[PDB]
Write a protein that binds this DNA or RNA. Structure first.
Lengths: 899, 320, 238, 210
DNA sequence: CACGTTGATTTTT
DNA sequence: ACAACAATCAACGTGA
């Protein structure tokens, strides 16, 4: 199957949708061959088919099983009467209509009538125009619903008016309704969308169309639109509980550093003060885990503890001291406001009231709180019989004692909730359900905050990822996915505000990315992450959004070695890629639907080219497999939308310059993608031949491989020879001789001097092959193949620079004649052929040697190499490599065409 | 020459920009293997080959504004330190440091090329400039050279194990030309001699300047105007088209064809122009500025006045 | 009264520090109106003080009559630039550095000792708009206007060729109703007798633009497939 | 300190000797030859079991009397630092690949110029010297060193550079002897270069790597 | 503002 | 025969 077939057939449920499954089994793979290569006609027909099928489910009588087939065929033909029944015959058989139903040629009159009156000698088989009624109104609904551009385009007059009078003529008593979310922040935007979906289905709404910022629904006519103040509290509880359980499990909101365990500002809001202290024994059992070099001996050394106490501790210095010291540290640092009510508790809820005086537990410098590492090491020395797991069973009970004790005394605050308030205001600016009241935004506050961003009357920095229209706070190593503390143009110049700002909205989003992508905090940028965003061609059907869920949660981590292997095999037909296992019934049904469908690369090498090789391939590939539109960028913030973005199928924001050197456009139409994939796989299959090692692709050298291919096209054969040298193989396969030549013809395609040099290197060898032919079956050496060209080049290089071209032609042809007469007679095509008189064999040999030598001295040396021996000496090696590949190609072409 | 041009310039540095531009038209010729890199490759961009309506695109080397302005700028600061107008010592009253809080607010570099401390002052660069482009294609204009770094005992092996210290690096070739316009707003006469000084006196650019990267700045004309004249890209695309792509020409034919292409362009651009110093008037102007930069008394005088003018601007209108 | 269709071609790479994420600084794909308004009319109309010192050196003067670098001078000149639509674009991500002027250099951590203040120490990557780009804007004025055929924009004062045509009275027409603007439009410059019904937004300093909007009010159909808001002026919402 | 460093902790230091790629005064075609080299078994033949070794290849080598004009430049030296760098220029004699077998050269210092900034490129001195000879490059090394001296002085009078001292000819062949007298004297050299060590160690503790 | 301090990630047939 | 590099480019906390 194709990847698009594979994803789509999962979304169906056979008990009463089998006819749409017959289409995906047979017409769909032919559809994306003819129509697959702005917008693509295969993705238009697929969304049109699916949307009419979803409209059909509402009809109060079931459409006949014969008529469902007419809809499925008619909706494919619609992009183009005896003068049209033949254009239906040609196109149907190309599209394998036969396999959907063999019967179709009977109904071709109807199938052509639904795709464009009088019968013209072709009478309709379907009983009466009461069956053409639902068919024609279904077909004309899909082919306008898929041309909407935003959820508002059904309340805006341009296409929405006709969608209502169509639905009325279909007798459905449902009504179009929408949601839209104008502001598009990543996972938080996806969560908001999927909570509105999960809410409105309880009103019996059913989504009909999906867009990058929203949904259109068929919803009943007698339903209340959900209240603004209610979907606010629902969507906050959704996001705050889903992130809540993640912080409670410890995979987000906590970070280890040198001053001990830290907690994110938002953890302090989303968990009550009593919750965090009950979770700490489990987060230390995840975040405090270095058994190779734990903190306690390092901390105790800088305490200078001495006094014959040191050995009581040091013989038990272990990870199980750290975990307790880190817990006591974070509770002291964040939970209790004055220390003395709590140092007196821990020193008696543990048995250390005597050994350690209250004030000697607070010793610190630079926040490192050395004193608790002494406390923990006494409790761990006294109970030294424990292992790590029976210790964690202690510390879980110690935390729950601390939690209960703190709240019976009331020693912790009901901390503020600022991210709820700014999130309720984020919803009030940027979320709309159809029939909500709306206000003009006060953009003055967004300017006023910028005008003061570098002035003392701004308390926290302005957001680095947005405009600063919502309250912001300093970036944290435990919140953001990258370095918090680098130079900012937004912070005042020469000020002490060295940390950048983040909006409280983007702070939840970075934490949702830690929680739901499972990426590092403050360190994800060093994985060189490039993000591919799979935007719609305006509209997706519900089955396509389910298909894109099965992709973005299930896609295989690409390895280019076997993508190479399955394309040099299959003779470079790019259609082979359609069938490969790109993934790992639906399996991701519990995950949220991707409204902004993001997939990302991770690299461990340090260069920009090492980052881009998989994203650039995937960003061409997914539009070629699924008809989606891809933008590849380094930005964790996604691109803000407009109708100008859609004017190309792919964008690649700032590819390593190998892209531009190859002359591939950094934005591509659907007509450009198969040229581009051919050039990208051609450069990968040449780089993985030379400048690679079998386990190490060395993508840091792809800029050296491209610059050589572009400078002079014969380097394609110089690299093929290096690959033969690494593989320790003495000659290319028959496949390699046409592969590396189709690559040279591909990279030369636009250039006059390269097409001239590639035509010259063939002509050069095709000329000496008139008088010399070593048979490749005898396993000859690279030198034996190049005997006349090596003796031509050595002549040009050895003579004084004063001597004429017409002297070189004579001296070198003498050396060719002298060399040929020392080889065995079977190698000499003109002399071995006894059919003609001896002086005429001599005369034909002499003029064949002369014309070859004239091409070497006139065209190879004089014109191409500028008549300069320095410029020839640099090329001697690649001219030789190019001529060996030319000789083997001319021989492979001869041994075929001689039949 | 210089005695006639003294009328054109401002008599002292103005507060507001007045729209007097003196434009230096140059060909920067590569002399030994410069490396204009960022991100580990020679910087390149796709461009149209020339102005005459081509379908034909061309990858050309780009020398960014930073890569040419900073080597000019820093060659001025070391001259001012050698004249003793500024100092490197943290205990001196005329300290200037290139980027931090310790930047001066008075010296010629700070007023002509600008500074930004924060609230304690900033000044806009009066030397305007553009990113320069190779006249020919990247495929014609570069070569890649291997480097290695063995043990001092002459061997890639030490103690029986190999060093990983080999790689390629990418270099521009010893005849590649980068057509350039540098432009100076609202300058005093001595401000023009300081900046024109930097253009003629600095000689190395790009990475590895300790070992490579000499360029010859051939000045081709000076043009006094009410406004911005044309871009480096537009001059380069005009110059390629005047040659029809026969890029293999000697330095003096390439400079004289740039002098007539500059005048062909200046006639079309809508700004009024007071003076057009080209040819034998430029070669006498260049001799008359070379004569300042070779004389200890004359140069200490002019640059002393520049200092005073910029110290006076600083105290009257500048950052005090 | 007069309208000029101005298309901007980048003759070197343009950078604005629109957003920052770790080592990466990036440029939004729309040129903000107020940036282009000073690029066109600063020195010709708006004053251009070479130096700043004080609060005036880090506080904008966009719409403050008390300061010289106002965009309000242009309200009185009867001129208004709209923001810029990208017709064709590309990005280059290029590193930039601090110079080691001294013979000896230590790589210092930002915020470390000798590095405790916000300055461009170390290195960063700028996502610039590239030479391979073209943008479209409109200037509307009440007087024939001597527009400069070259402008400079952004963090590095980068050259743009402006090629400009006055849209003649034979091909514009004036109307009023509901219209899809389809050009970018700045919400701060929106007067009374315009109201914004729908918008799609591009979040950007100093203030967000609309990339697409539906408006109710007066307009000029300047060619058969674009509609430009009439009566916009700098800061009209204040 | 003088030639710089950049590996590991404790920073990086820029070379105070500034150098550039040098060019042959003549064309490649008059200035090189290709020589075959082979490697037999010690038994004196290219076979050890009847089979061939085939260990035969070409390499290109620059001919004798081929001349490379160049300017080495030294910034911010002490007097002892000048004696060290100048010592390297007079005391080195092998250059290319395969030092063990090849690549001796004769450095004739033709001038020393004290200066406020950079003078001409290597390529420019080469292109001036070729023009002054008219391309008639088969002239003896004494005439070639005397032609380089007059073109270097012609070019220096066209450079925007204050020239404090211009040591050429009879003053330079005085100075070259006064420096040979350092490098042939065990006490004088130890003292001078020992002072340099202190100067460079004090630079290191005051401004460099501490 | 100026002193002090020192843990983390997961992997490219 | 055998290497394709090698390093460096904060993130807070606390007291005055």
């Amino acid at each position: 199957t194709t990847l698009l077939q594979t994803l789509l057939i999962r979304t169906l449920s056979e008990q009463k949708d089998y006819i749409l499954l017959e289409y995906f089994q047979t017409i769909l793979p032919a559809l994306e061959e003819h129509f697959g290569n702005d917008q693509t006609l295969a993705a238009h027909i697929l969304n049109a088919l699916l949307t009419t099928w979803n409209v059909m489910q509402e009809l109060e009588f079931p459409l006949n099983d014969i008529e469902r087939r007419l809809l499925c065929l008619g909706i494919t033909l619609h992009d183009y009467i005896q003068e049209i029944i033949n254009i239906c015959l040609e196109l149907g058989k190309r599209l394998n209509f036969d396999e959907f139903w063999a019967d179709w040629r009977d109904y071709i009159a109807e199938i052509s009538y639904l795709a464009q009156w009088s019968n013209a000698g072709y009478p309709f088989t379907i009983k009466e125009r009461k069956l053409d009624h639902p068919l024609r109104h279904l077909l004309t609904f899909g082919d306008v619903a898929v041309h909407l551009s935003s959820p508002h385009d059904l309340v805006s007059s341009t296409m929405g008016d006709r969608l209502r009078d169509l639905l009325n003529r279909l007798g459905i008593e449902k009504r179009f309704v929408y949601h839209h979310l104008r502001d598009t922040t990543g996972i938080l935007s996806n969560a908001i969308h999927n909570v509105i979906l999960r809410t409105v289905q309880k009103l019996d709404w059913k989504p009909l169309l999906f867009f990058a910022q929203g949904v259109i629904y068929f919803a009943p006519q007698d339903t209340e639109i959900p209240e603004r103040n209610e979907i606010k509290q629902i969507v906050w509880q959704g996001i705050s509980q889903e992130l809540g359980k993640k912080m409670s499990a410890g995979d987000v909101g906590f970070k280890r550093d040198g001053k001990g365990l830290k907690v994110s500002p938002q953890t302090s809001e989303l968990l009550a003060a009593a919750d965090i202290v009950r979770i700490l024994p489990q987060v230390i059992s995840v975040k405090v885990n270095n058994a190779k070099s734990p903190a306690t001996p390092k901390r105790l050394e800088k305490l200078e503890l001495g006094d014959a106490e040191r050995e009581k501790l040091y013989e038990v210095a272990d990870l199980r001291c750290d975990r307790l010291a880190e817990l006591l540290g974070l509770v002291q640092k964040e939970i209790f406001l004055l220390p003395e009510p709590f140092i007196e508790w821990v020193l008696k809820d543990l048995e250390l009231t005597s050994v350690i005086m209250p004030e000697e537990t607070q010793v610190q410098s630079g926040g490192v709180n050395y004193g608790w590492y002494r406390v923990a090491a006494h409790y761990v020395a006294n109970h030294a019989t424990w292992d790590l797991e029976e210790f964690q069973e202690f510390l879980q009970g110690f935390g729950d004692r601390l939690a209960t004790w703190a709240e019976e005394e009331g020693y912790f605050a009901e901390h503020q909730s600022p991210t709820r308030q700014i999130f309720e205001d984020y919803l009030d600016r940027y979320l709309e359900i159809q029939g909500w009241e709306s206000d003009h935004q006060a953009f003055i506050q967004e300017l006023e905050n910028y005008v003061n961003a570098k002035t003392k009357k701004s308390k926290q920095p302005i957001c680095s990822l947005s405009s600063g229209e919502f309250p912001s706070e300093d970036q944290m190593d435990s919140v953001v996915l990258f370095k918090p503390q680098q130079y900012s143009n937004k912070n005042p110049l020469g000020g002490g505000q060295i940390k950048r700002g983040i909006s409280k909205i983007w702070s939840l989003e970075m934490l949702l990315r830690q929680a739901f992508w499972s990426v590092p905090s403050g360190k994800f940028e060093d994985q060189q992450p490039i993000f591919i965003y799979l935007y719609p061609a305006y509209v997706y059907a519900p089955q396509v959004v389910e298909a894109i869920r099965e992709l973005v949660y299930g896609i295989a981590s690409v390895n280019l070695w076997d993508v190479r292997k399955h394309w040099v095999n299959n003779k470079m037909d790019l259609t082979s890629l359609k069938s490969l296992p790109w993934l790992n019934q639906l399996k991701y049904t519990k995950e949220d639907l991707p409204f902004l469908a993001t997939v990302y690369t991770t690299t461990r090498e340090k260069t920009d080219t090492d980052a881009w090789v998989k994203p650039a391939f995937l960003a061409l590939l997914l539009p070629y497999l699924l008809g989606v539109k891809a933008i590849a960028t380094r930005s964790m913030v996604p691109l803000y939308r407009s109708d100008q973005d859609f004017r190309e199928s792919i964008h690649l924001d700032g590819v390593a310059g190998f892209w531009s050197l190859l002359g591939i456009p950094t934005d591509l139409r659907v007509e450009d993608i198969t040229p581009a994939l051919n050039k990208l796989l051609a450069i990968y299959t040449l780089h993985l031949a030379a400048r690679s090692s079998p386990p190490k692709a060395r993508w840091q050298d792809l800029p050296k491989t491209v610059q050589e291919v572009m400078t002079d096209v014969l380097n394609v054969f110089a690299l093929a020879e290096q690959g033969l040298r690494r593989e320790k193989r003495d000659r290319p396969y028959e496949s390699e001789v046409t592969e590396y030549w189709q690559f040279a013809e591909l990279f030369s395609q636009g250039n006059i001097v390269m097409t001239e040099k590639l035509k010259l290197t063939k002509r050069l060898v095709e000329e000496y092959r008139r008088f010399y032919q070593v048979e490749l079956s005898k396993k000859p050496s690279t030198h034996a193949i190049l005997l006349p060209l090596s003796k031509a080049l050595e002549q040009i290089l050895s003579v004084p620079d004063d001597w004429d071209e017409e002297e070189l032609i004579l001296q070198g042809s003498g050396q060719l004649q002298a060399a040929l007469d020392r080889q065995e007679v079977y190698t000499r095509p003109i002399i071995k052929d006894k059919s003609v008189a001896y002086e005429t064999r001599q005369l034909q040999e002499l003029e064949a040697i002369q014309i070859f030598m004239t091409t070497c001295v006139r065209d190879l040396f004089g014109e191409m190499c500028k008549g300069d021996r320095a410029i020839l000496q640099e090329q001697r090696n690649r001219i030789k490599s190019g001529a060996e590949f030319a000789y083997r190609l001319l021989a492979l072409e001869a041994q075929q065409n001689q039949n | 020459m210089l005695d006639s041009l003294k009328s054109q310039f401002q008599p002292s540095f103005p507060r507001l920009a007045s729209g007097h531009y003196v434009h230096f038209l140059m060909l920067r010729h590569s002399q030994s293997f410069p490396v204009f890199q960022t991100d580990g490759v020679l910087n390149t961009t796709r461009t149209q080959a020339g102005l005459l309506e081509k379908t034909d695109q061309l990858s050309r080397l780009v020398m960014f504004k930073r890569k040419q302005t900073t080597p000019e700028r820093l060659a001025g600061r070391e001259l001012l330190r050698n004249l003793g107008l500024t100092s490197a010592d943290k205990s001196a009253k005329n300290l200037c440091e290139y980027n931090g809080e310790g930047s001066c607010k008075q010296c010629p570099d700070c007023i002509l090329y600008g500074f930004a401390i924060g609230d304690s002052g900033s000044e806009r660069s009066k030397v305007y400039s553009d990113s320069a482009f190779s006249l020919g294609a990247y495929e014609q204009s570069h070569r890649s050279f291997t480097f290695n770094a063995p043990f001092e005992g002459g061997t890639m092996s030490e103690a029986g194990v190999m060093r990983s210290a080999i790689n390629e690096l990418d270099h521009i070739l010893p005849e590649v030309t980068f057509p350039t316009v540098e432009s100076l707003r609202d300058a005093t006469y001595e401000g023009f001699i300081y900046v024109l000084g930097n253009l003629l006196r600095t000689k190395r650019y790009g990475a590895q300047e300790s070992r490579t990267g000499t360029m010859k700045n051939h000045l081709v004309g000076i043009v006094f105007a009410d406004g911005e004249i044309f871009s480096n890209l537009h001059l380069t695309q005009a110059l390629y088209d005047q040659m029809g792509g026969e890029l293999n020409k000697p330095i003096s034919e390439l400079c004289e064809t740039a002098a007539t292409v500059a005048q062909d362009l200046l006639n079309k651009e809508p700004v009024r122009k007071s003076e057009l110093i080209f040819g034998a008037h430029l070669d006498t102007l260049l001799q008359e500025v070379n004569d300042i930069y070779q004389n200890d008394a004359e140069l200490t005088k002019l640059l002393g006045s520049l200092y005073q003018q910029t110290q006076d601007y600083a105290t009257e209108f500048g950052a005090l | 009264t007069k309208i000029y269709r101005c298309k901007l071609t980048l003759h070197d790479n343009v950078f604005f520090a629109s957003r920052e994420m770790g080592i990466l600084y990036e440029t939004e794909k729309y040129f903000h109106n107020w940036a282009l308004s000073y690029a066109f009319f600063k020195g010709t109309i708006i004053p251009h003080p070479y130096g700043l010192v004080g609060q005036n050196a880090q506080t904008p003067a966009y719409l403050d009559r008390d300061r010289e670098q106002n965009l309000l001078h242009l309200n009185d000149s009867g001129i208004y630039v709209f923001p810029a639509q990208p017709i064709h674009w590309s990005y280059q991500i290029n590193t930039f550095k601090a110079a080691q002027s001294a013979y000896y250099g230590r790589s210092v951590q930002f915020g470390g000792k000798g590095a405790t203040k916000n300055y461009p120490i170390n290195y960063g990557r700028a996502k610039e708009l590239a030479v391979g780009s073209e943008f479209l804007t409109y200037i509307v004025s009440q007087k024939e206007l001597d527009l400069p055929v070259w402008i400079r924009l952004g963090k590095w004062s980068s050259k743009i060729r402006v090629e400009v045509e006055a849209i003649a009275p034979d091909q514009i027409k004036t109307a009023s109703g509901v219209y899809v603007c389809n050009h970018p439009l700045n919400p701060l410059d929106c007067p009374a007798n315009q109201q914004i019904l729908l918008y799609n937004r591009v979040v950007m300093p100093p203030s967000s633009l609309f990339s697409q909007s539906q408006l109710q009010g007066d307009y000029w159909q300047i060619d058969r497939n674009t509609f430009l808001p009439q009566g916009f002026h700098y800061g009209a919402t204040t």
